[PDB]
Amino acid sequence: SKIKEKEYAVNKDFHTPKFDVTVKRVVERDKVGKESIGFQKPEDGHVFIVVEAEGKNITSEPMKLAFLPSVDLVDENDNAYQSDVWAASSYDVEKGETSSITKELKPGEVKRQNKVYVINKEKFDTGKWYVVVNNEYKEQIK
Ligand SMILES: [Cl-]
């Protein structure tokens, strides 16, 4: 139809030894970016699936960004998807998240970890989908 975006609220925090990972929402959309920096569109029959997430260092020492837990979009056949780093970057600027990130998070510091996937729309729309955190939690979004 004329519906450009469909949203799935999660709004849950998941505890891992070093980080509390919050998953805010998953968004199905036709494009990412800003008019100033240009827009990106997925190719025919595909959509961008955006998983908005963030991690908070809950230890008393700085921890490396490399240790942030994995957050993956997973289908009913257990295929876990790899984020499109370019689309994710456009989506980040789109949201005003424009600042190089640091290599470590400080104690109590929060770091955005938005993922953007390019998925077949029919597959996304007709199947069951989940967000898997640290290969430890499985949250069904649809
Ligand atoms: Cl805690």
The Cα 108–Cα 120 span in angstroms is 38
Distance from the alpha carbon of residue 58 to the mean position of ligand 1, in angstroms:
6
Give the closest residue to 71 by CA, choosing from 122, 12, 127: 12
The Cα 108–Cα 137 span in angstroms is 22
Distance from the alpha carbon of residue 22 to the mean position of ligand 1, in angstroms:
12
Distance from the alpha carbon of residue 37 to the mean position of ligand 1, in angstroms:
39
Phi, psi of 17 (to 5 degrees): -55, -45
Distance from the alpha carbon of residue 71 to the mean position of ligand 1, in angstroms:
18
Q: How many CA atoms lie within 13 A of 130 on its CB side?
A: 16
Do 32 and 91 meet the contact criterion of CB atoms below 8 Å apart?
yes
Distance from the alpha carbon of residue 54 to the mean position of ligand 1, in angstroms:
15
**Tokens at residue 124, please?**
């996304």
Distance from the alpha carbon of residue 15 to the mean position of ligand 1, in angstroms:
6
Do β-strands 19-29 and 5-15 pair in parallel, antiparallel, or remain unpaired?
antiparallel
131 burial type by CB count under 10 A (0-12 exposed, 13-18 middle, 19+ buried): buried
Which domains are seen in the chain, by residue range? Answer: 1-142 (2.60.40.1240)
Identify how the structure was determined: X-ray
Distance from the alpha carbon of residue 63 to the mean position of ligand 1, in angstroms:
15
- Contacts for 117 with CB less than 8 Å, ≥ 6 apart: 48, 49, 50, 51, 73, 81, 82, 83, 84
The Cα 44–Cα 117 span in angstroms is 15
Q: What is the 3-state secondary structure (H, E, C) of the chain?
A: CCCCEEEEEEEEEEECCCEEEEEEEEEEECCEEECCCEEECCCCCEEEEEEEEEEEECCCCCEEHHHCCCEEEEECCCCECCCCHHHHHHHHHHCCCCCCCCCEECCCCEEECCEEEEEEHHHHHHCCEEEEECCCEEEECC
Give the closest residue to 123 by CA, choosing from 84, 76, 85: 76
Distance from the alpha carbon of residue 57 to the mean position of ligand 1, in angstroms:
9
Resolution (A): 2.2
Distance from the alpha carbon of residue 101 to the mean position of ligand 1, in angstroms:
23
